[PDB]
Amino acid sequence: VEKVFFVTSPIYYVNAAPHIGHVYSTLITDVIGRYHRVKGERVFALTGTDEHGQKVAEAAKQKQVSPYDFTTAVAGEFKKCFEQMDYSIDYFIRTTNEQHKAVVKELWTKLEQKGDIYLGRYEGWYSISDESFLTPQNITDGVDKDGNPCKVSLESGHVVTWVSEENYMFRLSAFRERLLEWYHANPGCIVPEFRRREVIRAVEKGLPDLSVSRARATLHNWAIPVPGNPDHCVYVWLDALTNYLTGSRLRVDESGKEVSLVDDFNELERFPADVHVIGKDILKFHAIYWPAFLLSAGLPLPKKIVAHGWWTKVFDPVEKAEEFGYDALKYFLLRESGFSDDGDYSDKNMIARLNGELADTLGNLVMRCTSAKINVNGEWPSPAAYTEEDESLIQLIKDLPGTADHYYLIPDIQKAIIAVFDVLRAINAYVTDMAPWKLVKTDPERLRTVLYITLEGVRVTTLLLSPILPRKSVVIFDMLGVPEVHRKGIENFEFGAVPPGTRLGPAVEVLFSKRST
Numbered sequence: 001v002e003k004v005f006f007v008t009s010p011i012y013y014v015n016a017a018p019h020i021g022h023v024y025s026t027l028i029t030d031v032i033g034r035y036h037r038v039k040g041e042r043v044f045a046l047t048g049t050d051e052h053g054q055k056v057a058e059a060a061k062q063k064q065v066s067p068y069d070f071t072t073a074v075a076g077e078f079k080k081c082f083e084q085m086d087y088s089i090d091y092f093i094r095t096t097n098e099q100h101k102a103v104v105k106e107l108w109t110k111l112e113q114k115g116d117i118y119l120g121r122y123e124g125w126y127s128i129s130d131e132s133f134l135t136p137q138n139i140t141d142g143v144d145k146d147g148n149p150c151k152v153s154l155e156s157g158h159v160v161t162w163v164s165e166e167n168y169m170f171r172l173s174a175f176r177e178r179l180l181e182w183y184h185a186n187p188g189c190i191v192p193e194f195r196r197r198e199v200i201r202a203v204e205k206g207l208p209d210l211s212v213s214r215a216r217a218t219l220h221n222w223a224i225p226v227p228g229n230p231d232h233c234v235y236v237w238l239d240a241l242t243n244y245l246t247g248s249r250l251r252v253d254e255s256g257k258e259v260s261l262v263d264d265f266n267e268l269e270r271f272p273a274d275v276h277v278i279g280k281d282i283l284k285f286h287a288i289y290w291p292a293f294l295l296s297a298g299l300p301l302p303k304k305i306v307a308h309g310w311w312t313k314v315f316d317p318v319e320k321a322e323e324f325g326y327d328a329l330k331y332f333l334l335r336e337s338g339f340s341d342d343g344d345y346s347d348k349n350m351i352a353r354l355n356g357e358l359a360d361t362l363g364n365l366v367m368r369c370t371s372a373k374i375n376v377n378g379e380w381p382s383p384a385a386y387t388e389e390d391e392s393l394i395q396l397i398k399d400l401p402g403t404a405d406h407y408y409l410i411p412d413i414q415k416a417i418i419a420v421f422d423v424l425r426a427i428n429a430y431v432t433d434m435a436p437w438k439l440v441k442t443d444p445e446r447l448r449t450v451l452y453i454t455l456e457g458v459r460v461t462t463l464l465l466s467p468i469l470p471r472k473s474v475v476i477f478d479m480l481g482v483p484e485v486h487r488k489g490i491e492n493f494e495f496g497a498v499p500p501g502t503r504l505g506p507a508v509e510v511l512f513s514k515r516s517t
């Protein structure tokens, strides 16, 4: 089914300035979106801000300014950050948007009509910071900003409070069987696998109904009213999760502003999401609540939720990008960490990867095959006959796109990078064995073959690395003189797509500059 590939980030609470957490989540969303655009697919990537709720309102009250002013300002800080980071997100959604609120009301009303929302009570624990209902098994003893004894969440460590409110309740308990059927029929719907298993174990244990409204005083009147009941506000999470639906329904102009909300999601061919990128801290809301709501409303379910290893709720990414380069930092963040906190994020390791992989492996190779000493005609040469060693390298280059494609689709961007760099290491080894610098004087016919394979390997690896290194990839292709048309599209994943006789671009000038150890 040819639709628009729909990839999302979470929408971030505006209680606080943007930091690495949000940058990382949105980076992953951006990389996926970029890969599918490189593949030649229609893409709509979404990110944004989560602006209502008790947590934000109390942050605004702490800074002594109105919630409207506060949210608008911080939303601006997030936008500025994502421009600075040079993402290619198609739209930035804010839950304060009137068209978003409209959608929330439509969805709420649908749930109510299907009989899945009733008036009840929630009596139990709540983490305002996580906007999360917790059971007594999920709390323990801790301390508040003072240092007084209190209760805190086991999930997150933030303070919990007991809540006793008459609330509108969603009949989540009724969706346990269908959610379990969903997880089992779609065993790749949650990545990584151990997080999928975690969700299943949880839903197996049983599901309580879920409070989807709060008394308006509690949220300092900073939330969406419940349709037909002004005394209640819609739970920030139902509000927040609904952004995905809203985004799927907005026509957006070339400038990036929302201009229209379509009635039927199918008009824009985005819903449901093909990939929801989230942090591990909000898995339950996306893998349990969200699909339960969609099941109630008869809406289609997302294909994949990928939950990465860091919590999204001192290390300044803009500052490090100014120091080491933007693409470099992006490469590091995506290469250093798989689905764990077990990444080494120090300057030592940043420089180690910068010098070792980016400069020594990739950059060095680019200069070798474009060098005036080795590539004396400044062109793609026409290869002669291939040796078995030539063919071994060629096979790797041919196999690479299929391998990288699967990884990007899991999605597992770390493994995609590793796969490309395995081939880059192999090309370097080949170049070292063939010693093309010596062949310029000794065997020009042989050099043609060696140089051509090298150039082609570099092009193909660069193409598959272009979602990770969007700017540097362009520089590389410019050096190789690859025409624009060949920088995109699955047809150009194939070996030999750039014909011999193509001229290299002019030289000026380093690709990645190494740094003091």
Ligand code: MET
Pocket: 009, 010, 011, 012, 013, 050, 240, 241, 242, 243, 282, 312, 313
């Ligand atoms: C619908 S995604 C909501 C995410 C939440 N606002 C957070 O920052 O953790």
